[model samples]
Every structure is written in structure tokens, then in C-alpha cells.
Target chain A: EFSVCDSVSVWVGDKTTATDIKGKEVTVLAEVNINNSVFRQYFFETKCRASNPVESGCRGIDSKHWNSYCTTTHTFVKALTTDEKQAAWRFIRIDTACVCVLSRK
Target chain B: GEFSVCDSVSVWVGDKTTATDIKGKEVTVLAEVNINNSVFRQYFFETKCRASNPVESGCRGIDSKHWNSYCTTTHTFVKALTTDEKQAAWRFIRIDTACVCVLSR
Candidate 1:
């Protein structure tokens, strides 16, 4: 039961960092059903299992989560631009990613 | 200053089971994301302090004391790759927003 999580996080575009750290382009193949007119998509993931979590300001967006092993680490990006390999001394904190529960069944 | 005029964000490659954080936990990294034209296509964020940390209005008394356990964002429409993109499905979450603590687990 090792299916990938519905979320992701990134900080560098290094060969040993994130997949295609330089980043790749996934144009949601234009199709029907949706507005189908440049439909920009969005989503998030969390692993912090708690009694209750918090929410952001956007009525449309929330940061709610529960007591788990991991939570978000105040990190985000307008976009991922650095493609060069960063110094190995950098810590891979939770920049931005979805909730992925890696359990051993 | 206008996301109305967007652009592409070349993603890095690969996911490091060994993250680059203080805890060095594992996380997912994205590449097919975008940034329009921000400086680094990236920016740092600061979420609302915990109810116990210095104390803020929004997070005031909103901590584990009241059953709150984790932090999260508000609700916003986002795209998820977990499901079929052709199913008119759109997930909601924010990548750019402050956070607050809540109660659940």
C-alpha cells in the first residue's frame, strides 16, 4: 500500500531533490466537463493528525488537519524558479506539499 | 502584480526520501507548477502564531487546551491529481495563505 500521496512539496530543482526539480509542465490536457477554458486547478495535503487544525483566511481555502506525524512548515512559492543544485547543507523543510500518509500495511 | 497574466514554472526533478529540513522528514516535490513572473517564482510565508506562542487574536485560546491540535488554511478551489482530471473534479486548498490552529483529533 505505497500509492503516492495526493500532495507534494518542493524547494529546489536538483537531480537529488524533487522530481524534475527544474520542474515539468502538466497542462491538464484540455478537455470537456470543466469550464474547459483555462481551468487553473488547485489542491493541498496535510499529515498532521490532531484533535483539530486551523484554517486560513480564504473562505475557499482551509489549513485544517489532525494529529499525525507531519504538518506544514510555513513554506510556499509564487513559483519554483531555482533549478540549480542547492548546497547540501540545506534542510528540506515542509515548503509546500499535499498530505501523504506513508503507512506499512 | 498581475497573476491575470500568468507564465510557466519549470519544475525540478525527483523526490528525495530524505528531505532538507531540520527534521529531515520525507515529502513530495512538484515540478509541473507555475509562477506567472514573481522574482524567484517563490516566496516565503508566515502563518498565524500558535495560541500559546506570543498569542494572537485569531489563534487566541485556539490551541490544544480547547481540543485544537493542528494548523491549516481556509477553503479554496484547487486541482488534485489524485483523481481523474477529466471528471470535472477540482480540489480546494491554498498554497499562499496564513494558517491558524484548530481542534480535531
Candidate 2:
């Protein structure tokens, strides 16, 4: 069984350098759902995980997440004048882990 | 001057609707759904008219007036988050207001 922990020091792995598998383009092989609107997307094919994790803030709207292997990003915009209301879009960062198997292999 | 005027509108484009307006000028308007199983986000429109002459010259400027309006909304957002989750929704949450007034003699 594999588990992703909140802090890098507590991650159960071979203690391999995180840089070994970063920046590789990989498919989302699988993911684990932590809670409501909070899940971790995995890139097992490239043998890498997110360098950082994400956390849900304020009903998942401010949810943040990131992956060096990810191929996509989102954008948001505002109105021209200040008289108009404002809005924003953002991804959440929950948690991150380093895969130690391949780097050691 | 005795008064100033400004208008604003904001919306979240979700499964239900999309709209944008600033200073009474419409930026965008649409009736469509772009996400599956999504619903309405949020929409807000507001304006105010105050006696500008009694206030500082800052009141005559649109930027300052907008700041005055947006600040109120921000205060509300922060307070609501601290007090009760039930009082708030994250997506498209905004506070927009406009004031049109002149200096009174």
C-alpha cells in the first residue's frame, strides 16, 4: 500500500532526492480522494508526484494544487473598471510527496 | 460637486449563468452552462450616492470611490469567514458599490 503524507519528513519512502523524477511529462495514472473536493492527482507513469500538495480553502473555491508534470493551467480575469464587482479563480494546494522507488532503482 | 455616481455588477460563470459589468457598461453577458453537474455561483450588483462635497477630494475620483466600495465588501468577506461558513459562498463572491455625489454648500 502507498500513502502520501502531509510533510516530506514523514513521507514513507526510500528517502530519495525529489529532483530525480521532477519535470517529466506523465499521465494521471491515479489519484486518492482525501475528503470533500480534496483529492490528489497522481502521475505514476512518469514515476513522479506533485512537488507540493494542495488544500481546500473556503468551500473548495480557493482550493490549490500544482504539479511540475501537469500539462494544463487555468486563468481568470477582472472587469475594466473598479465600479464593477470582482471575481477570481484559483487551485488549492493540499499536499505533496516524493516517489522514492524509481530514483533508487 | 455635490454627488458622484458609479454602478457595478459581478457574476460567476458556472453551470447556470455568466455576466460582467463595470461603471454601468456591460462587459459580458451569457446564458449557458460550461460545466457538467454545476449550478449557479453568485451574482451581485450595487451602487451608492453620497454628498461628495463634505468629504475629501478623494471622493470625487472614481478610483477612490471604488476603493471605498470594494473595501466594504472585503471587510464583510473576512468577517463572514471568521464568524460562520453558513453565511458565505466562495465562488464569485464580491462586494461592489458606486457613489455619485457632489460637494454640499
Candidate 3:
């Protein structure tokens, strides 16, 4: 099962076996607990239309708290210093016509 | 049912070592009478405004942050203390959905 927002869509499924679409946009939000610390990681689709979506993906005051947004399909795991794992992260679709898929990686 | 906006009511009916819910259904806590001091301070007011040509949209530039946008969209505002405290209780800014990009001073 998956949930979505007014401007964002989330679908949970294994992407390795999903249908292929040119310029497909997806962001996977996952929660991980390590040594009693909670952290989150996001997975983005391989094809995106925004020329520099990552430039705005993670910016400003909380930039240092996150890893650089990846252009390719990738995963990030790290120790968190604060409980922002639940509060400070978000996934946005730069172009509305694009689709974003969410999954557990 | 009970209502209290400040420290007058028995909101937290527990001791330093322990605390318990005083209102079974709902309880609203407020720190001070100032708009910026209330829980509602975290809430934002969003309305469509032209990023450029603010006067054309009948929207005044509340702060430098408005210059970042050139297209019309829902801009956000939070309860704030203005240079002249007697002025409007809210100030506006352009923010990512996660709420970032404003400079701190």
C-alpha cells in the first residue's frame, strides 16, 4: 500500500521489475533504525526532466543534514544527529507532469 | 472539556517526575499573547501572488525573500514580529515544501 499528497504521488513496489517509461520520476522514502538511531533515505527515478532538480532537492539550512540528491538510482544510509528522520525531509516533483514512485529499498 | 490559553488552568496535572493528560479530548497550550509566541506561529498563510510586479497583484513585498520568485504561486507567511511591532502580525517568504531557503539573521 502507498499514500500520496496533493502535488506528489507515491507508489510502493519493487522497481527492478516495473514497467519502463521515458523520463519517469520516482522518490522512495524509507526509514532505517541503527543502534537506536533513526535515519531516512530517498531513492529517485533514473529519468527526470528538471534540468537541475537535485540543485533544489536538498538546500538551505538543512542541507548539511542531508546527502546530495543523487541523479542516478541510488541509496543513502547514515547516522542521524537529530530526530529529523521523521520531521525534516520531503520529496518534491519539479515538473508536475512527471510521476514519482515510492518504495522500500 | 476545558479551555485555557495560558498558565492559568491546570493544563499539566502532574509533577516534575511525571505528567498526565488533563483534558481527555483536547488541550491547547499557548506560551504568550504575542502572535509569534503562540502555537499557531508554526502555521503558514498561503495565497497566490505574482512573484514579479507585486503591486500589480496588490501584494506588497513583506521581505527580501519574495524576490526569489518570478512566477505566481502560493506564497507562505508565518506570525512574526515586525520592525514596527504595531504593524501586521505576519511576514512572508518563499519556501520549499520542507520550509527552507530564508536567511537567518
Candidate 4:
């Protein structure tokens, strides 16, 4: 299959789908991983459970940690570095309409 | 006849009644008593007043120790203590839920 295998493209959410998927256009919002990696091989959710109300619980990370994190929604953009790409591709389990940013300890 | 304030049924713990279960709990009222025995004709008396304004209805400030935060809604304090400082026995910050503030140094 022909693939854009070098970056994580931004996908918009389609309100009508059960998957809450966006249209086909995946804009490279930020390099969340190092070494151009294609995210098509993995699955991520843009929004979490609407039925469950977590005090920052739905984000998988606690409210304190996440709240301390950057508060970028639409204007922030970057590419995932080598380590960032690996963590996201391997460990991240996002279930919201959030842009995946790469973070390395 | 044996005289006593205890027999006064109409006694009330007002804003200035120095009695049991005092109406207001002070923050850091120091009382240093180094009495040797009961023969010492002495009693506890406040020697110093080292207390911050007992947080009011809308007292807002940052804690010096943890620098957590003290708002009208949530006020907390965490001080670093040492063995030598035990006798002095710091009052630590008193988070008065009624006033919603941390009364500290």
C-alpha cells in the first residue's frame, strides 16, 4: 500500500462515525516521534468515553501531571523526536481529540 | 459556701471567654514553660505571637514551604522540619476550613 511513512499526520474527527475519525487528510501537526515514522500501523482515539467522567482520569495521566503539562490545543505544532516517536507508536493510548506531542525523559 | 464559676449555668463561651474548648483556635501562640516541679509558682503564658492572619473568607497566598497554594476554596501547607526544631514545636500552618486559608509564617 502507498503510504506517507515519514510523519504523524493530524487527523480531524468525523462527528458521525463510531470511531470518531476525521477526514482522510492527516496534516503533520507535530513530529511526536523521531526518525520519520508512519502512524498508520497503529490506532489512537481522539476522544475518550463520554459516559465516564474522570477527574483527568480519561487522559490516562493524572490531572496534576497533565494539568502541569503544556496547554496547547490548536496553535502548538512539533515533530516527534526519535525517542518521542517510539513512545507514542509503542505506548501511547490517547482517546481524545488531542494532538499527540512527543515527550522523552 | 464554696464559690465557683462552674456553678454559673448561664456562663457562655463568648469571643473572650478563656475557658474549655475555646471558641477560636489560635495559630502560633508560643508558651515556653521550663518549670522544674509543682513547687514552681508559675503557669503557661503566651510569650510570642508568630501567627499569620488566620486566613479569611478570601485570603489568597502561596505557601513558603511547598509553595502549594492557598485559595478560599483549597488551602494547604507542608513545612520542612528538623529534630532540633521539635521543642520549639512549630505550629505549622493551620488550614482553617472556615476561613479557607493557611495561617503560617
| Top model number, lDDT | 1
Over A12-91, each residue of candidate 1 has an lDDT whose tens digit, in order, gives: 22222232222442122122244655432122323333212223321111124322222333233232222344322221
Docking class of 2: incorrect
Query: What would the per-residue lDDT of candidate 4 be over residues B40-68, giving only the tens digit for each residue?
Result: 11111111112223233212222233322
Q: Give per-model CA RMSD.
A: 17.9, 23.3, 20.8, 28.1
Give residue A52's lDDT in candidate 4 (0 to 100). 24
All candidates' TM-scores? 0.20, 0.18, 0.17, 0.14
TM-score, candidate number 3: 0.17
Best by DockQ: 1
Clashing pairs in 3: A26-A101
Q: Give me the runs in candidate 3 sitting further than 4 Å from their true place.
A: A1-23, A40-91, A94-105, B1-48, B51-73, B76-105
Give residue A5's lDDT in candidate 1 (0 to 100). 19
**TM-score of chain A by itself in each prediction:** 0.20, 0.15, 0.18, 0.17
Please, what are the lDDT tens digits per residue for candidate 2 over residues A1-105? 112211121222122112112232222212334566543321111112333322321111111221111111111221111112432221211112121110110
* Regions of candidate 2 where Cα sits further than 4 Å from its true position: A1-105, B1-27, B31-34, B40-42, B50-96
True-contact fraction per candidate equals 0.10, 0.00, 0.00, 0.00
The full ranking of all candidates by TM-score, starting with the best, is 1, 2, 3, 4
lDDT, each prediction: 0.27, 0.22, 0.23, 0.21
DockQ of each: 0.07, 0.01, 0.04, 0.01
Across B1-105, the per-residue lDDT of candidate 3 in tens digits comes to 211000111111111111111222121222234455553222211222223333332112212232231222221111122222243322222221121111122
- What lDDT tens digits, residue by residue, belong to model 2 across residues B1-105? 111121212343333222222223212322333467784242223322333232343222222322331111110000001112233222322222222221111
lDDT of 1: 0.27
lDDT of each residue in A1-105, candidate 4, tens digit only: 110011122343221212111222222323233478733222222231232232431222223422211111111111221232332211111222221121222
